[PDB]
Design a binder for this molecule. Structure first.
Ligand SMILES: CSc1nnc(Sc2c(C)n[nH]c2C)s1
Length: 208
């Protein structure tokens, strides 16, 4: 069954700001998410040097970008460390609470939304373009979960009965009506080249 949770007030607040502030440079969402993926790949690569059995759920360490115009989704997939249930419901939120306070204070002083990644909370930049974000994830010592949120102060988590994914995270961006540009090959490739050219894992851009 589906469990429903309230975001921490500070996170809810950061998400409304992301969603409501006029800010044209939305494309930065892709580097923050690819960056999130790279951090998670680094994590499993490291942890595997002292316990190679952690790669029994898959050896290949990569990132796929998968647009689907029919579904209006852009999907980022990684085979990084994945998330446990406690990560999804509690730990990540707890870590992000100071990232968010800091970021929110910088934002007067005249920092802008593109700096969001320096405060460790870039994942929420998904909300610049996605009306809903669904996240399938699988950590080595835990079950596959689906996390989901359309913002508004709440998120859901259920155990995921769908197709097994080995180990990693899939971020499914259900794009807003006027953000379908991030479904085009040339647009994605441009952004990847501009902001994420030196990521240390293969990034495959799938075509439709
Ligand atoms: C609430 S779901 C979620 N939070 N933070 C992320 S960043 C991340 C990605 C993009 N892959 N793995 C991780 C930990 S995904």
């Amino acid at each position: 069954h589906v469990e429903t949770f309230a975001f921490q007030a500070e996170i809810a607040q950061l998400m409304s700001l992301i969603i409501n502030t006029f800010y044209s440079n939305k494309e930065i969402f892709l580097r923050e998410l690819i960056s999130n993926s790279s951090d998670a790949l680094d994590k499993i690569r490291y942890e595997s040097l002292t316990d190679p059995s952690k790669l029994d759920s898959g050896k290949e360490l990569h990132i796929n970008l998968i647009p689907n115009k029919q579904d209006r989704t852009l999907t980022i997939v990684d085979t990084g460390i994945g998330m446990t249930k406690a990560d999804l419901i509690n730990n990540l939120g707890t870590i992000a609470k100071s990232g968010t306070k800091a970021f929110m204070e910088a934002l007067q002083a005249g920092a802008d939304i593109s700096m969001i990644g320096q405060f460790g909370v870039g994942f929420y930049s998904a909300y610049l373009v996605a009306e809903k974000v669904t996240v399938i994830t699988k950590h080595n010592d835990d079950e596959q979960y689906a996390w989901e949120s359309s913002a508004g102060g709440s998120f859901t988590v259920r155990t995921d009965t769908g197709e097994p994914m080995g180990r990693g995270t899939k971020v499914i961006l259900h794009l807003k009506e006027d953000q379908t540009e991030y479904l085009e090959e040339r647009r994605i490739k441009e952004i990847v080249k501009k902001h994420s050219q030196f990521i240390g894992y293969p990034i495959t851009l799938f075509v439709e």
